[PDB]
Amino acid sequence: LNHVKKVDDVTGEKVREAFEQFLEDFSVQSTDTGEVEKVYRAQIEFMKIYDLNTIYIDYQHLSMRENGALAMAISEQYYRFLPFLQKGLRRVVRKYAPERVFQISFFNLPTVHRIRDIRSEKIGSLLSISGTVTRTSEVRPELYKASFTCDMCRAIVDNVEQSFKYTEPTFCPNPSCENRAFWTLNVTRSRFLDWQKVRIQENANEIPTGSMPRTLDVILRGDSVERAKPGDRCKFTGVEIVVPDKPSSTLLTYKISFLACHVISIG
């Protein structure tokens, strides 16, 4: 059965080309003694040394190209562009370089916003959050992408399963298992990554006691794992999302769980 076809991504492709061209082209201000050439090609090439499979690019540089009009697609609509920013970036690496897990972490956001200033309009958007860490937790694997099959019985399907449920694989199978059947869990084909949760709390100097400061969950996914310390202020990359923990889905209880794909000890 042919899948006809796929649609449409529209702007997503425009942002793919813009971001690719941006990570390619300068991205250089300084002249003479630089800080010149490239810096991002040189960033990836410097990255070829340790091959830790992450990149660092500044948001301020990204705003300079289109005058911030490029940064807007990457701001409010950002999570729509996560699968595009990754594979797209790989389309670059495949060209300039010779086992692929890529964690993109933006940084240096124009304005830092407190946990109190957190709104439901800020979802799917980069927001810098400052505050002290409380209750770090031990690092465990995420399923990331999995092969769970067969699933009745020989299929061996490896795809998707990227979203957090984790249920379920084996749906719309094999071709053709028609499972149902067992899930079935296979952990040897499934690459894992990271992660550690930290519960971020507002700094005590800002909060007007009587306050009773309101903590909120930030899970660290990415190589920024372990970079966080208890009793200290940290700046993160926003990706606010939500996690299940109001209407029903008929033929749901949610809360704000902040994500950070980048960490720094600033504060």
């Binding site: 899948h3 979802i123 939500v242 029903s248 889905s249």
Partner: protein, 275 residues
């Protein structure tokens, strides 16, 4: 006349009765002055006064239509103040460059409708009404996100079409979008992509100064919404206005059954203020 269900507050009637309410001191026993202050700042949130419509004529009845039926009356009031902004702009010709400033969202924030006695006195007979309350706040809950416009997906093809929530429920079409494609397979609901709106929750003791003595005061959880969210901290003894709500709770556990005794919370459309 466009009768609307059981609330029976007529569209294309009360809109005009409110539209000619404009430009009044009057009376009293501001009004357009404060609105003219409002148009520059872009702060929206028109606080109103209440009482205005009483004893003033016309709209002696509108006060009773709002008090007895605040749900619709607030929405209609917002539409009318919006179109009275639209009619304010055409008077001065080109304003603020240009039409975008009208597009921005506005709302009425009614307050001080009669003097209600406590939470305790309240009859179960009035469940859609504007209700004063007073008491300290024991805690301000973390923000829960609320559905506004829902997003959906399928394995085919995949297509991006989505539908708004409207009433407090979510029904996704079985099959399917665009086209067609089909097949029957269940819809995939993306959790993060859809829009959200701020809903806090605020616990309130009933007037600790006014008590059966010695029985400990009763909790009233008022859920607020929008801008009002995270606009307060704790222990504020002053006062709050808003629409009373009784909604069913799911009990044991699972089972998809209703406990048949509806819990009660206040929508709290407006807040105010200090000591």
């Amino acid at each position: 006349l466009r009768i609307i269900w059981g609330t029976n507050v007529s569209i294309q009637e009360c809109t005009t009765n409110f539209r000619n309410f404009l430009m009044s001191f009057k009376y009293k026993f501001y009004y357009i002055k404060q609105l003219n202050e409002m148009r520059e700042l872009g702060t929206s949130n028109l606080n109103l006064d209440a009482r205005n419509l009483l004893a003033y004529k016309q709209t002696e009845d509108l006060y009773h239509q709002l008090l007895n039926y605040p749900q619709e009356v607030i929405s209609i009031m917002d539409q009318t103040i919006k179109d009275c902004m639209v009619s304010l702009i055409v008077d001065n010709n080109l304003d603020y460059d240009l039409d975008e400033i009208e597009t921005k969202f506005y709302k009425v924030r009614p307050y001080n409708v009669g003097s209600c006695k406590g939470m305790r006195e309240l009859n179960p007979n009035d469940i859609d009404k504007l209700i004063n309350l007073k008491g300290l706040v024991l805690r301000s809950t973390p923000v829960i996100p609320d559905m506004k416009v829902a997003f959906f997906k399928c394995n085919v093809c995949d297509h991006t079409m989505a539908v708004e929530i409207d009433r407090g429920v979510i029904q996704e079409p079985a099959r399917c979008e665009r086209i067609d494609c089909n097949e029957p397979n269940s819809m995939s609901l993306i959790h993060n992509r859809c829009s959200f709106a701020d809903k806090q929750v605020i616990k309130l003791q009933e007037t600790p100064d006014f008590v059966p003595d010695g029985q400990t005061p009763h909790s009233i959880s008022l859920c607020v919404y929008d801008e009002l969210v995270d606009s307060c901290r704790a222990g504020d003894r002053i006062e709050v206005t808003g629409t009373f709500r009784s909604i069913p709770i799911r009990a044991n556990s699972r089972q998809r059954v209703l406990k048949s005794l509806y819990k009660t919370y206040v929508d709290v459309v407006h807040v105010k203020k200090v000591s």
